[PDB]
Amino acid sequence: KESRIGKQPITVPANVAIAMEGQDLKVKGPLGELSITYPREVLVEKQESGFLRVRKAVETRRANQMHGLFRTLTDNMVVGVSKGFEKKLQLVGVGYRATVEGKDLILSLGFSHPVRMAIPDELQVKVEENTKVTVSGRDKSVVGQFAATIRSWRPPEPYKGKGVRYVDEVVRRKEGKA
Amino acid sequence: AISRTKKEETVETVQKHLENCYLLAAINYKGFTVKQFQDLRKALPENTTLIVAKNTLVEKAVQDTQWAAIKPCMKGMNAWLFVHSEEIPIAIKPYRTFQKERKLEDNDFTGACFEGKFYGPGEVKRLETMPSKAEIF
Amino acid sequence: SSRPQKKGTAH
Amino acid sequence: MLSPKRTRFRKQHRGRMKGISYRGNRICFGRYALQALEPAWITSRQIEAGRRAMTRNARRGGKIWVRIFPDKPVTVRPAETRMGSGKGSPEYWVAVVKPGRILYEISGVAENIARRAVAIAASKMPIRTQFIISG
Amino acid sequence: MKIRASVRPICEKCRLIRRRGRIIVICSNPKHKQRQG
Amino acid sequence: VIKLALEAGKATPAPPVGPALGSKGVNIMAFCKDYNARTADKPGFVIPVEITVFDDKSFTFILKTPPASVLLLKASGAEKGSKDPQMEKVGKITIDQLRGIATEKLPDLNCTTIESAMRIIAGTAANMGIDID
Amino acid sequence: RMASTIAIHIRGKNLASYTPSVDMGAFVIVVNADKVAVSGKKRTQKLYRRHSGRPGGLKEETFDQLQKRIPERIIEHAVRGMLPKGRLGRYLFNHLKVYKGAEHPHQAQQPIDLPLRDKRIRVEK
RNA sequence: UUCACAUCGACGGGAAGGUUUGGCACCUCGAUGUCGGCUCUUCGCCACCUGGGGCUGUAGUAUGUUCCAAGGGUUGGGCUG
RNA sequence: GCUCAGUGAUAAAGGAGGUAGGGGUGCAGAGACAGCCAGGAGGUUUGCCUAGAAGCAGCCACCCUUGAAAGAGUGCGUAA
Ligand SMILES: [Mg+2]
Ligand SMILES: [Mg+2]
Ligand SMILES: [Mg+2]
Ligand SMILES: [Mg+2]
Ligand SMILES: [Mg+2]
Ligand SMILES: [Mg+2]
Ligand SMILES: [Mg+2]
Ligand SMILES: [Mg+2]
Ligand SMILES: [Mg+2]
Ligand SMILES: [Mg+2]
Ligand SMILES: [Mg+2]
Ligand SMILES: [Mg+2]
Ligand SMILES: [Mg+2]
Ligand SMILES: [Mg+2]
Ligand SMILES: [Mg+2]
Ligand SMILES: [Mg+2]
Ligand SMILES: [Zn+2]
């Protein structure tokens, strides 16, 4: 009940259509549709002033953790269908490059083969041949995921900073060879 | 923190610096060096008193001394000027020139109080044009 | 291992 | 290594360890102290090590009293020695401590350096212990 | 990652977490990573 | 912007100064003779100097405090300070040498009075082992 | 909790006419055998092992692999444990008819529903 | 080099195992018998190699140490009871 | 009332924002914790040592001043 997260109500802006059936929430915003189901304890209230205030059926430690989580969840699916989410990763090195073509993202990371990546519907990936890549999508979870999958292939190494990194990163740089 | 005794003696020292002075000057500061703080404190303590205080610490010290019409000046950060000795224009004039050098250094003039009356950010221009005690007398 | 077990009537 | 200079009989009874020690209970010398929580047998080597550890970790802090001492002998029979034909040879010396007993006393430091030093001391002890402050 | 019975924060930036029942130490620098066990 | 330590009326040796601030694009003879003229206007002492440089290679420099350790080494008549300050005392200076070293170093301090400068110099002399009364 | 009730009825222990040496019991038809519920982490932990009879002939399934592969075995194996063992035991166990679907082809036998007097037997989410 | 915890880790302590050398004498005395090879298995994991990893005082190659891992592998000879 | 470990079958030192209680002691309504904005100064590059030691290799001293506050400096870093 006293989580500084669950007390703050969520603002649903105009352009945002909120359809509530029981514990199941379907939001249709400018960019598309997002669906989630709530657990037993969490009761989210759709106000008359156009706000979302989260309340909880009982207080277990369980439900406390729960309502904090879900207030942030559905704030992120609201702000997700309204505006959207952009994860941006740049690549550092010699010969490193990326090309979006049709349904694939082609990565040349210095492997023998070109790495092919199937891009999901919900995502739109913009590419700078200047070795930057931004992915935009309405769901924070899925964009974050795919971003990580990119970064996975060649994680940033310590010495020369080479590899795929997020736009803002502290990369421990050891001095090799001294 | 600060004990209630130290804050009652601080509001009492600010009220005793309030009763002797004829004019108030409100100034807010965010993101500035200590060097120009100590140059402003080379120029100020000579002719005038400068006191940096909390919103409520200024509230309960000014309400009683009948400076209350200055209550909207206490929203946001608060640094104050009382004139104990020298005139009003010799204190108010350096602060606006220091706000024209502080344009990129983040200073703004909220308001001043003279004759028991409240003058806004632009109405203190008059308080700057006033002459020294040699020209008035 | 410096501890024994409980055999028979002990147990 | 602490040890008695003389005794008549070499060999001695295991004895039996019971109760509280009411006498060594107080802290009469220093400021902070290490108190023995449990009924055990301290070899001279352990006291040595604990003292050395506390001494080195304290250094610039002044004083360490050792409030105990290993005056009771202990005997062992060699390896592959069939049982019978006499009690064995005394190898080492132990001190018998019971719960409540004080081991180490320490003075000349802030309470922090003392808590840390006493911890490193209690690490070489066979027994559970406690940190106490003078009254 | 070191694995040991006794895990302590070895500096200021260290953090003791609980992951799937086991106690771990995550830090800024990789040498201070530990797992209980 | 670079910080160097130079002698009073002597400038432009090859190893200490010229290459160091001359690889940042600073003119050597103008800085060295302006610094010798500015140490000829004040009392000549060893000066740590901060030389600020700009994109057009022009430069403006501020002469910092002539060291209170060097001024209190020449005021107590000694050369080397005390290896263990406040344990072994290597000399003594009067309060008038306090006000003198705090008048020469007064344009270079942040102090608002002469008593603050005098207690600053008494603190530095309490720091290098030199007694003051 | 269900398998206990099942065992009681199969064995006959709820009839006044009960006899240990005879089958007075019922038939029981268990349906929707993949929807059966189990508490705790048990779905991923509880362990069904069976052994070949050669050395290193041990095989282990988590409850869930089992329930995806042949889910009836779960309830068959949980009731068989609570029946008597031995001749009358086995002959009994043949009266337990289990189906994974919501449907059973016994409609001819006119099944009644099984009474449950247990409080905790019904789980809710 | 700086740095206890890359790698070692003195003085001490807390354990597990039941493979070494032992204590016991519960065991079998009538014909319940020890060490190596051959053949033939089989199992454990405290992992030698092969599969995946974390840390390095890991530039690279090669290590070091440690984590999960026992599916498979683990030569032929000169010499010895 | 408690446990979420299938603990409920067995073992220790040690470890721990596990969890449910109980007891002291700190602060706060002139606003406490966390976050975020700024400041973090002058002596001085403390003395010694060292080619250099400038808070930050080592040693000793560890005061004073301007102050809302600021250690002769907690860690990183520079040949310095
Ligand atoms: Mg045993
Ligand atoms: Mg008793
Ligand atoms: Mg007695
Ligand atoms: Mg112990
Ligand atoms: Mg350790
Ligand atoms: Mg016998
Ligand atoms: Mg026979
Ligand atoms: Mg293993
Ligand atoms: Mg391997
Ligand atoms: Mg490895
Ligand atoms: Mg190498
Ligand atoms: Mg294997
Ligand atoms: Mg095998
Ligand atoms: Mg094998
Ligand atoms: Mg061979
Ligand atoms: Mg168990
Ligand atoms: Zn750390």
Tab-separated table of N, CA and C in Angstrom, chain D residues 19-106:
chain	number	residue	atom	x	y	z
D	19	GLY	N	29.615	-26.133	33.814
D	19	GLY	CA	29.182	-24.890	34.433
D	19	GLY	C	29.613	-23.576	33.803
D	20	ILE	N	29.577	-22.535	34.624
D	20	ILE	CA	30.067	-21.214	34.265
D	20	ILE	C	31.340	-20.977	35.071
D	21	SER	N	32.250	-20.165	34.547
D	21	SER	CA	33.314	-19.614	35.377
D	21	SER	C	32.854	-18.234	35.866
D	22	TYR	N	32.624	-18.126	37.173
D	22	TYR	CA	32.159	-16.877	37.758
D	22	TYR	C	33.286	-15.904	38.049
D	23	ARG	N	34.498	-16.425	38.169
D	23	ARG	CA	35.617	-15.604	38.596
D	23	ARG	C	36.236	-14.728	37.498
D	24	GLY	N	36.532	-15.315	36.343
D	24	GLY	CA	37.150	-14.566	35.265
D	24	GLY	C	36.169	-13.674	34.523
D	25	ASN	N	34.944	-13.578	35.035
D	25	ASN	CA	33.849	-12.888	34.352
D	25	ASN	C	34.095	-11.411	34.060
D	26	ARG	N	34.659	-10.693	35.025
D	26	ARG	CA	34.818	-9.243	34.911
D	26	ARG	C	35.897	-8.840	33.919
D	27	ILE	N	35.824	-7.600	33.441
D	27	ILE	CA	36.945	-7.047	32.696
D	27	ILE	C	37.636	-5.979	33.569
D	28	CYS	N	38.756	-6.380	34.181
D	28	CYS	CA	39.453	-5.563	35.181
D	28	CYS	C	40.718	-4.826	34.721
D	29	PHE	N	41.172	-5.072	33.501
D	29	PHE	CA	42.446	-4.499	33.081
D	29	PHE	C	42.242	-3.451	32.011
D	30	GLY	N	41.727	-3.884	30.869
D	30	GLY	CA	41.518	-2.989	29.755
D	30	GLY	C	40.113	-2.437	29.604
D	31	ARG	N	39.804	-2.087	28.359
D	31	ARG	CA	38.578	-1.399	27.964
D	31	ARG	C	37.626	-2.340	27.227
D	32	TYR	N	38.107	-2.908	26.121
D	32	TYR	CA	37.295	-3.839	25.336
D	32	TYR	C	37.812	-5.265	25.516
D	33	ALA	N	36.940	-6.260	25.365
D	33	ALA	CA	37.382	-7.632	25.602
D	33	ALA	C	36.649	-8.716	24.808
D	34	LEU	N	37.329	-9.856	24.701
D	34	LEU	CA	36.821	-11.058	24.045
D	34	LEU	C	36.354	-12.088	25.070
D	35	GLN	N	35.068	-12.428	25.038
D	35	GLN	CA	34.501	-13.333	26.043
D	35	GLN	C	34.160	-14.705	25.461
D	36	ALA	N	34.589	-15.769	26.140
D	36	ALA	CA	34.340	-17.137	25.680
D	36	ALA	C	32.903	-17.584	25.959
D	37	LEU	N	32.190	-17.919	24.897
D	37	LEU	CA	30.792	-18.294	24.999
D	37	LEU	C	30.561	-19.759	25.359
D	38	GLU	N	31.542	-20.610	25.053
D	38	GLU	CA	31.334	-22.066	25.031
D	38	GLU	C	32.428	-22.876	25.745
D	39	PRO	N	32.069	-24.074	26.250
D	39	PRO	CA	32.932	-24.923	27.094
D	39	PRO	C	34.102	-25.631	26.395
D	40	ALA	N	35.257	-24.992	26.229
D	40	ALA	CA	36.315	-25.693	25.508
D	40	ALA	C	37.756	-25.613	26.047
D	41	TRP	N	38.627	-26.295	25.307
D	41	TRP	CA	40.014	-26.580	25.649
D	41	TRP	C	41.001	-25.838	24.757
D	42	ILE	N	41.663	-24.811	25.269
D	42	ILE	CA	42.497	-23.987	24.400
D	42	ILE	C	43.949	-24.410	24.441
D	43	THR	N	44.484	-24.805	23.295
D	43	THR	CA	45.904	-25.116	23.203
D	43	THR	C	46.704	-23.823	23.318
D	44	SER	N	47.960	-23.921	23.741
D	44	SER	CA	48.810	-22.742	23.866
D	44	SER	C	49.077	-22.091	22.503
D	45	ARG	N	49.089	-22.924	21.465
D	45	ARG	CA	49.330	-22.468	20.105
D	45	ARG	C	48.224	-21.548	19.619
D	46	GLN	N	46.979	-21.866	19.967
D	46	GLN	CA	45.843	-21.013	19.599
D	46	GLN	C	45.869	-19.648	20.275
D	47	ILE	N	46.176	-19.624	21.569
D	47	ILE	CA	46.285	-18.361	22.289
D	47	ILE	C	47.390	-17.526	21.675
D	48	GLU	N	48.510	-18.188	21.401
D	48	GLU	CA	49.623	-17.547	20.724
D	48	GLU	C	49.154	-16.860	19.436
D	49	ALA	N	48.520	-17.630	18.554
D	49	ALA	CA	48.066	-17.111	17.265
D	49	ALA	C	47.073	-15.962	17.404
D	50	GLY	N	46.100	-16.111	18.301
D	50	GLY	CA	45.098	-15.078	18.520
D	50	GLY	C	45.729	-13.779	18.985
D	51	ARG	N	46.659	-13.900	19.932
D	51	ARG	CA	47.373	-12.742	20.460
D	51	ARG	C	48.164	-12.055	19.349
D	52	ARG	N	48.920	-12.837	18.578
D	52	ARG	CA	49.714	-12.319	17.461
D	52	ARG	C	48.857	-11.570	16.443
D	53	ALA	N	47.704	-12.148	16.113
D	53	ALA	CA	46.784	-11.559	15.141
D	53	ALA	C	46.218	-10.237	15.640
D	54	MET	N	45.795	-10.226	16.901
D	54	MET	CA	45.231	-9.018	17.481
D	54	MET	C	46.298	-7.926	17.612
D	55	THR	N	47.511	-8.333	17.977
D	55	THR	CA	48.656	-7.431	18.121
D	55	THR	C	49.029	-6.778	16.800
D	56	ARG	N	49.123	-7.585	15.752
D	56	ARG	CA	49.519	-7.059	14.459
D	56	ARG	C	48.409	-6.173	13.875
D	57	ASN	N	47.147	-6.600	13.952
D	57	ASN	CA	46.064	-5.764	13.414
D	57	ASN	C	45.820	-4.470	14.213
D	58	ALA	N	46.119	-4.488	15.512
D	58	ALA	CA	46.027	-3.261	16.297
D	58	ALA	C	47.226	-2.335	16.068
D	59	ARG	N	48.455	-2.874	16.161
D	59	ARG	CA	49.717	-2.124	15.933
D	59	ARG	C	49.704	-0.800	16.739
D	60	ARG	N	49.517	0.338	16.063
D	60	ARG	CA	49.507	1.675	16.688
D	60	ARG	C	48.620	1.803	17.955
D	61	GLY	N	47.621	0.927	18.111
D	61	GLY	CA	46.888	0.802	19.368
D	61	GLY	C	47.640	0.015	20.432
D	62	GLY	N	47.521	0.450	21.681
D	62	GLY	CA	48.464	0.055	22.710
D	62	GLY	C	48.587	-1.346	23.283
D	63	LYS	N	47.528	-1.857	23.908
D	63	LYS	CA	47.712	-2.900	24.920
D	63	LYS	C	46.790	-4.124	24.832
D	64	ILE	N	47.410	-5.296	24.956
D	64	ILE	CA	46.717	-6.578	24.935
D	64	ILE	C	47.105	-7.449	26.126
D	65	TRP	N	46.135	-7.698	26.998
D	65	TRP	CA	46.294	-8.645	28.092
D	65	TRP	C	45.769	-10.018	27.682
D	66	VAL	N	46.527	-11.058	28.003
D	66	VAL	CA	46.051	-12.424	27.843
D	66	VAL	C	45.630	-12.949	29.216
D	67	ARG	N	44.326	-13.090	29.429
D	67	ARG	CA	43.808	-13.362	30.766
D	67	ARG	C	43.786	-14.843	31.117
D	68	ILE	N	44.240	-15.679	30.190
D	68	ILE	CA	44.291	-17.115	30.435
D	68	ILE	C	45.693	-17.673	30.217
D	69	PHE	N	45.811	-18.992	30.350
D	69	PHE	CA	47.107	-19.659	30.408
D	69	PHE	C	46.953	-21.176	30.545
D	70	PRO	N	47.739	-21.944	29.770
D	70	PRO	CA	47.684	-23.412	29.631
D	70	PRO	C	48.508	-24.231	30.648
D	71	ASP	N	47.988	-24.411	31.863
D	71	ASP	CA	48.721	-25.097	32.933
D	71	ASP	C	48.406	-26.593	33.143
D	72	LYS	N	47.409	-27.106	32.435
D	72	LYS	CA	47.051	-28.508	32.567
D	72	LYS	C	47.641	-29.320	31.412
D	73	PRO	N	48.443	-30.341	31.736
D	73	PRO	CA	49.120	-31.178	30.732
D	73	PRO	C	48.171	-32.079	29.943
D	74	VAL	N	48.573	-32.474	28.735
D	74	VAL	CA	47.796	-33.424	27.933
D	74	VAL	C	48.708	-34.392	27.188
D	75	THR	N	48.282	-35.649	27.220
D	75	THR	CA	49.097	-36.783	26.833
D	75	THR	C	48.534	-37.517	25.598
D	76	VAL	N	49.434	-38.059	24.766
D	76	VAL	CA	49.059	-38.830	23.567
D	76	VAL	C	49.974	-40.060	23.376
D	77	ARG	N	49.373	-41.168	22.927
D	77	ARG	CA	50.088	-42.382	22.497
D	77	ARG	C	50.424	-42.308	20.999
D	78	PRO	N	51.616	-42.799	20.598
D	78	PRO	CA	52.044	-42.734	19.185
D	78	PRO	C	51.145	-43.518	18.194
D	79	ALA	N	51.480	-43.466	16.900
D	79	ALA	CA	50.720	-44.177	15.861
D	79	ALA	C	51.183	-45.633	15.742
D	80	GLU	N	50.232	-46.537	15.496
D	80	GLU	CA	50.452	-47.996	15.531
D	80	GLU	C	50.974	-48.453	16.909
D	81	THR	N	50.390	-47.912	17.978
D	81	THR	CA	50.709	-48.357	19.338
D	81	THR	C	49.495	-49.071	19.940
D	82	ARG	N	49.619	-50.387	20.124
D	82	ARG	CA	48.558	-51.205	20.716
D	82	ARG	C	48.253	-50.764	22.150
D	83	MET	N	46.970	-50.790	22.512
D	83	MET	CA	46.507	-50.238	23.785
D	83	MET	C	46.963	-51.106	24.976
D	84	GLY	N	47.480	-50.441	26.008
D	84	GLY	CA	48.193	-51.094	27.096
D	84	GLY	C	49.690	-50.793	27.133
D	85	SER	N	50.322	-51.147	28.260
D	85	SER	CA	51.721	-50.822	28.626
D	85	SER	C	51.994	-49.322	28.915
D	86	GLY	N	51.019	-48.637	29.529
D	86	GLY	CA	51.208	-47.295	30.084
D	86	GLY	C	50.548	-46.103	29.390
D	87	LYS	N	50.325	-45.023	30.147
D	87	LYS	CA	49.799	-43.756	29.604
D	87	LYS	C	50.901	-43.051	28.779
D	88	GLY	N	50.500	-42.336	27.727
D	88	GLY	CA	51.437	-41.841	26.729
D	88	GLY	C	52.291	-40.648	27.129
D	89	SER	N	52.852	-39.973	26.129
D	89	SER	CA	53.760	-38.844	26.371
D	89	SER	C	53.012	-37.505	26.262
D	90	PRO	N	53.199	-36.586	27.246
D	90	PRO	CA	52.553	-35.271	27.070
D	90	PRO	C	53.117	-34.481	25.874
D	91	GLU	N	52.241	-34.136	24.928
D	91	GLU	CA	52.674	-33.423	23.716
D	91	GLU	C	52.651	-31.905	23.872
D	92	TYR	N	51.562	-31.419	24.463
D	92	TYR	CA	51.243	-29.998	24.509
D	92	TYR	C	50.529	-29.658	25.813
D	93	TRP	N	50.003	-28.443	25.892
D	93	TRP	CA	49.411	-27.943	27.124
D	93	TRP	C	48.128	-27.186	26.844
D	94	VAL	N	47.099	-27.405	27.653
D	94	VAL	CA	45.843	-26.713	27.410
D	94	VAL	C	45.386	-25.888	28.599
D	95	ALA	N	44.492	-24.953	28.314
D	95	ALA	CA	43.824	-24.159	29.327
D	95	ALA	C	42.342	-24.455	29.241
D	96	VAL	N	41.701	-24.700	30.375
D	96	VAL	CA	40.287	-25.045	30.341
D	96	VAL	C	39.427	-23.803	30.533
D	97	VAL	N	38.599	-23.486	29.538
D	97	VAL	CA	37.711	-22.332	29.657
D	97	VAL	C	36.234	-22.709	29.561
D	98	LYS	N	35.437	-22.046	30.385
D	98	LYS	CA	34.015	-22.307	30.468
D	98	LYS	C	33.282	-21.020	30.105
D	99	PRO	N	31.994	-21.115	29.742
D	99	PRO	CA	31.283	-19.919	29.273
D	99	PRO	C	31.271	-18.756	30.284
D	100	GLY	N	31.454	-17.533	29.789
D	100	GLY	CA	31.532	-16.352	30.636
D	100	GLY	C	32.968	-15.899	30.872
D	101	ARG	N	33.916	-16.819	30.684
D	101	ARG	CA	35.346	-16.565	30.910
D	101	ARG	C	35.904	-15.501	29.951
D	102	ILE	N	36.767	-14.606	30.443
D	102	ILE	CA	37.412	-13.621	29.563
D	102	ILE	C	38.744	-14.166	29.050
D	103	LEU	N	39.006	-13.930	27.772
D	103	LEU	CA	40.229	-14.386	27.137
D	103	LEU	C	41.188	-13.227	26.922
D	104	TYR	N	40.773	-12.300	26.065
D	104	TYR	CA	41.618	-11.186	25.669
D	104	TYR	C	41.071	-9.869	26.167
D	105	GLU	N	41.965	-9.033	26.681
D	105	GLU	CA	41.599	-7.669	27.021
D	105	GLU	C	42.418	-6.713	26.171
D	106	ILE	N	41.805	-5.615	25.758
D	106	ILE	CA	42.439	-4.716	24.811
D	106	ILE	C	42.124	-3.244	25.122
